[PDB]
Amino acid sequence: VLSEGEWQLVLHVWAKVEADVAGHGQDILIRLFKSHPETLEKHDRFKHLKTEAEMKASEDLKKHGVTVLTALGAILKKKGHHEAELKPLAQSHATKHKIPIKYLEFISEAIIHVLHSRHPGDFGADAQGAMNKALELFRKDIAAKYKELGYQG
Ligand code: HEM
Numbered sequence: 001v002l003s004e005g006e007w008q009l010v011l012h013v014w015a016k017v018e019a020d021v022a023g024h025g026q027d028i029l030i031r032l033f034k035s036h037p038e039t040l041e042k043h044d045r046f047k048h049l050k051t052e053a054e055m056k057a058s059e060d061l062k063k064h065g066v067t068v069l070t071a072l073g074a075i076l077k078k079k080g081h082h083e084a085e086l087k088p089l090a091q092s093h094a095t096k097h098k099i100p101i102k103y104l105e106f107i108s109e110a111i112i113h114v115l116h117s118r119h120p121g122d123f124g125a126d127a128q129g130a131m132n133k134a135l136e137l138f139r140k141d142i143a144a145k146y147k148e149l150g151y152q153g
Contacts, residue, residue, distance in 0.1 A: 006130040007079045010022050013127055014076055024114060025065020030055050031110040039103050076134055090145035100153035101143050108135040
């Protein structure tokens with residue numbers, strides 16, 4: 001459980017993300033694919049993009065980034081009351097895409113990295129700790145939903 005103050009820090013930095021969702025999404029996906037090349041293999045339409053510039057020029061990848069961050073933002077804004085938002089995400093990611101919790105850790109790292117890179121003045125230690133807790137809660141709850149669906153990833 002996050003404190004009200006922790007949620008406020010999470011949502012404060014998220015408002016900064018929302019000033020350019022597309023750009024944040026590109027940086028996050030690119031960081032993810034570069035830091036953990038195995039994750040790129042899950043995306044048939046992307047794993048052929050060979051360089052960072054190619055990734056940045058891909059409208060498909062940019063649109064996907066906005067899809068991912070929009071879903072995450074919707075979850076974060078519920079401040080933990082996110083069953084209705086999390087369930088469909090668990091369903092597709094457990095049963096169709098097959099994304100282990102370890103990969104969710106990978107993208108969480110990429111999110112923290114990009115948020116710090118772009119907003120250091122609004123993403124100090126306390127804000128990072130709050131965001132870390134929010135993403136930890138997200139991963140914990142989605143892991144339980146994964147198991148309900150029979151997926152042990
Ligand atoms: C913050 C964590 C994440 C959020 C909020 C998220 C959200 C989404 C959304 C909204 C979609 C489109 C609808 C759907 O299929 O559910 C999607 C599709 C997809 N995702 Fe995620 N995702 C996350 C983490 C990951 C990770 C780490 C990977 C592994 C590289 C991944 C692999 C995929 C794949 C392979 C598709 C299919 C779309 C297509 O076939 O073009 N996701 N995700």
